[PDB]
């Protein structure tokens, strides 16, 4: 088919390979170069000679994992050599940074001989932190892997030993837990003996379980202590002295049947004779031992664990080695045990014991998991399989003693797992991290912000996200029969206390009326009018936001900008001199960018500029940073008719409202943000160090640009996020994202704690 073809264009095309090895620091000015190299490169050196430990501190040992293989157990193509099996090599690499960022160096070794494969492998002690065995045929990798595992001090893992064991294993305990079936009387059959079917026997009676319920197969029928010593010895040491010696005969009574062998190793004949609830595993990759639909036309109480992507639990691989490196790594283990092992198993099997986000089903085109029998292992490409499995592996190292590093703070050690999805997620988790220490100065007094849209699914998927996270109260408007039905039917457990409030059968209905009717009865709005008005939601959240049964509201998913913001400048205002202003956050590596404003004024007046300016500065000064605000315009210092004389006139302005700020303008863009332009060329301006404010002579030029940005510049930008009101309130848009009503959300309650303590004072 194409798909051959395809494969081989994606290793050919621009550069050919799937790898490349890039620095992490600068390195393009002369000093970078000698930092990086003599006469600098000397001084890390010199610490690592003295103490042998700092070598986890100054090189990338702590984040390298080798993935060695000599190329005879390539897949199901078998002994092709290890040239042959480069391809596999780098894709391996690619999922352990895909989901575990970590750096690996894939080797192949031209060498079958296991005493010269464990040499080689045993002198490149010094350069990984963790070696990664790969597609070693037996009985080779079994030797291979005992004798490196005690001659090297560096984590080893045979990722086809005991990968495939481990991700089964979990499946195994949430296959029993919604069955009943105590390990205890659990009857385990294993056909196909080979590599991953030792492991898998062993890591099942770890898991509660007895050998005398183990039964192993073979192409030769079932295997037992009768046979004259089967094959190699490995295979005995879990062999039994059970009578049957046929896989028809051996199933029956059989709790469940691990499949490690080629396909169409099933008849119906032993579907029908194992228990009330049978647990399949169909785990031959070219074609399944039995079809999930087959075994659906057989006995439907039989459990089907397959490991194939085109059916329902999948076992995959790289749910557990990325996972279990990371976390042998970060607390900078010597060993792999069987301790880190089990608790792997463990998390893998509680994390399918949870939600399933909508990040989750939307990167599997949009379906629904449950912990049923459909969903009994998390899904290979869930994000929190790194946050919840390489915690419990790391805590694991701790216990067993194998870890030589101390993780004291393990809120922080997740959230540092959690910051390599990238500035995006550390800013809002700065943010909500603020929302919490905000909170707790407050007493534990989480802001109420109400949602106009809770019938709009975009909302309830975000409001799940956002209530395990203690952002927010959250206040549903709408029919509480009507918004309860779609609940239910979008399976959100968590969003089933929260608050649904009818805008009309409200007890302060009346009385949001009257306060509507009075704030606007000479502005064309009569008893009549406001009445309607006041059944609509937008109009009703903003007056509980307005009067106070609210800190926060958050609408504009359903309806366009414009009319969103309507009733918000309508029902709430502004402040003294405070004019409605969207913002928006360049989040860069190093820094973040204020733009303003990019969705409400048209083409602000010097006077209104200067606002904007004030009210972005503020929004910086909320975390921490220091505000260095520069008005945009397309000349450098020039003062002409127009624009630069609107923008210069706006830096005058705001510098006289707020002297304590660096206020500057009219500069272009490049001048504003780079600080060696600005020193070169200007060295008059007020502005130093560059500027994180930027603010923009109209709408046509802000707009643009935070769009450009995020398209072409490929930079995180999250926003908009409106100013300027009295109360808090922000606007959504029918495009917005799940992630980005969260970020609003987030914003809402940070802006909501700030207004109540300023109004506190
Ligand atoms: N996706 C996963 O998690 C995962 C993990 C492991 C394996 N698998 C799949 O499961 C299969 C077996 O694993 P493997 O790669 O280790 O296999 P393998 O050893 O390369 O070959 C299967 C072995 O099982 C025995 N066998 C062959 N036909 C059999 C039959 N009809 N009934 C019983 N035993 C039979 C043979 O043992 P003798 O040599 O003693 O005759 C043979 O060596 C492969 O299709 C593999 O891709 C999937």
């Known amino acids: 088919t194409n798909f051959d073809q395809e494969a081989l264009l994606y290793h050919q095309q621009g550069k050919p390979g799937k790898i490349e090895v890039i620095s992490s620091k600068p390195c393009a000015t002369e000093k970078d170069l000698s930092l990086a190299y003599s006469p600098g490169v000397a ?21 390298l994992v080798a993935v060695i293989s000599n190329g005879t157990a390539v897949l199901g193509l078998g002994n092709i050599g290890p040239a042959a099996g480069k391809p596999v090599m780098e894709g391996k690499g690619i999922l352990f940074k895909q989901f575990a960022g970590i750096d690996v160096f894939d080797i192949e070794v031209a060498a079958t001989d296991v005493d010269t494969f464990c040499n080689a492998v045993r002198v490149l002690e010094p350069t990984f932190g963790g070696i990664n065995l790969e597609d070693i045929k037996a009985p080779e990798c079994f ?55 030792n492991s898998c026997a062993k890591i099942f009676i770890a898991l509660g379980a007895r050998r005398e319920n183990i039964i192993m197969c073979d192409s030769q029928g079932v295997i037992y202590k009768g046979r004259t010593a089967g094959m190699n010895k490995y295979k005995e040491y879990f062999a039994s002295e059970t009578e049957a010696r046929t896989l028809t005969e051996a199933l029956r009574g059989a709790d469940v049947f691990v499949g490690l062998s080629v396909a169409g190793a099933l008849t119906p ?75 792997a198993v463990h998390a893998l099997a ?48 701790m216990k067993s003693g194998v870890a030589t590093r101390a993780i004291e703070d393990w809120d922080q050690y997740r959230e540092s797992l959690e910051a390599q999805q990238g500035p995006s997620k550390v800013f809002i988790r700065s943010a909500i991290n603020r929302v919490h220490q905000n909170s707790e100065a407050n007493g534990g007094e989480l802001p109420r912000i109400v949602f106009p849209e809770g019938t709009s699914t975009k909302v309830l998927k975000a409001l799940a996200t956002l209530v395990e996270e203690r952002i ?47 704030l606007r009865q000479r502005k064309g709005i009569n008893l009549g009018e406001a009445e309607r008005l006041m059944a609509d939601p937008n109009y009703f959240a903003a007056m509980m936001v307005n009067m106070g049964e609210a800190d926060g509201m958050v609408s504009g998913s359903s309806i366009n900008y414009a009319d969103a913001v309507r009733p918000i400048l309508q029902t709430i205002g502004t402040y003294k001199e405070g004019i409605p202003a969207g913002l928006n956050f360049v989040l860069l590596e190093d820094k ?57 006139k706006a830096a005058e302005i705001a510098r006289t409202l707020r002297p304590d700020l660096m206020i500057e303008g009219d500069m272009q863009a490049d001048t504003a943000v780079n600080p060696e332009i600005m020193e070169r060329l200007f060295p008059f301006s ?46 959504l848009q029918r495009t917005t994202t799940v992630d980005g009503i969260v970020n609003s959300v987030v914003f809402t309650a940070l802006e909501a704690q700030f207004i109540k303590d300023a109004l506190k004072a």
């Open 143 to 197: 030797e291979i892997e005992e004798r490196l595992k005690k001659e090297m001090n560096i984590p080893v893992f045979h990722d086809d030993q005991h990968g495939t064991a481990i991700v089964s294993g979990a499946a195994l305990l949430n296959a029993c837990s919604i069955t009943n079936r105590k390990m205890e009387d659990m009857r385990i059959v294993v056909n196909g003996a080979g590599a991953s079917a």
């Open 269 to 343: 004949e032993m579907l029908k004779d194992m228990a009330k609830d049978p647990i399949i595993f169909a785990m031959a990759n070219p074609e399944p031992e039995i079809t999930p639909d087959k075994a659906r036309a057989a006995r439907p109480d039989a459990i089907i664990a397959t490991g194939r992507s085109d059916y329902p639990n999948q076992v995959n691989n790289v749910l557990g080695f990325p996972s279990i490196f990371r976390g042998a790594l970060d607390t900078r283990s010597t060993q792999i045990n069987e301790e880190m092992k089990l608790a």
């Open 472 to 518: 927010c109260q959250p206040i549903l408007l709408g029919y509480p029969e009507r918004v309860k039905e779609k609940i239910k039917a979008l399976d959100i457990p968590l969003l089933n206390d929260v608050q649904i409030v009818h805008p009309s059968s409200h007890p302060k209905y009346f009385s949001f009326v009257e306060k509507l009717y009075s």
């Open 43 to 63: 001084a890390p050196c010199k610490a690592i000679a003295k103490d042998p430990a700092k070598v986890y501190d100054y090189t990338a040992k702590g984040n």
């Open 686 to 731: 007020g502005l130093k160090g560059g500027a994180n404010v930027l603010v923009f002579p109209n709408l046509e030029s802000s707009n643009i640009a935070y769009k450009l940005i995020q398209q072409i510049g490929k930079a995180e930008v999250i926003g908009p996020f409106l100013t300027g009101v009295r109360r808090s309130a922000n606007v």
């Open 350 to 397: 509680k994390l399918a014991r949870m939600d399933v986000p909508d990040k989750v089903s939307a990167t599997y085109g949009g379906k629904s998991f449950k912990f049923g029998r459909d969903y009994l292992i998390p899904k290979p490409f869930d994000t929190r399989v790194l946050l919840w499995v390489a915690p419990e592996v790391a805590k694991a190292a």
């Open 592 to 648: 973040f960018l204020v733009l303003a404003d990019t969705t409400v004024n048209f083409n602000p007046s010097a006077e209104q500029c200067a606002q904007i300016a004030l009210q972005a500065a503020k929004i910086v000064e909320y975390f921490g940073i220091e505000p260095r605000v520069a008005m945009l315009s397309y000349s450098n210092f020039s003062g002409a008719e127009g624009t630069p004389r609107k923008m210069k």
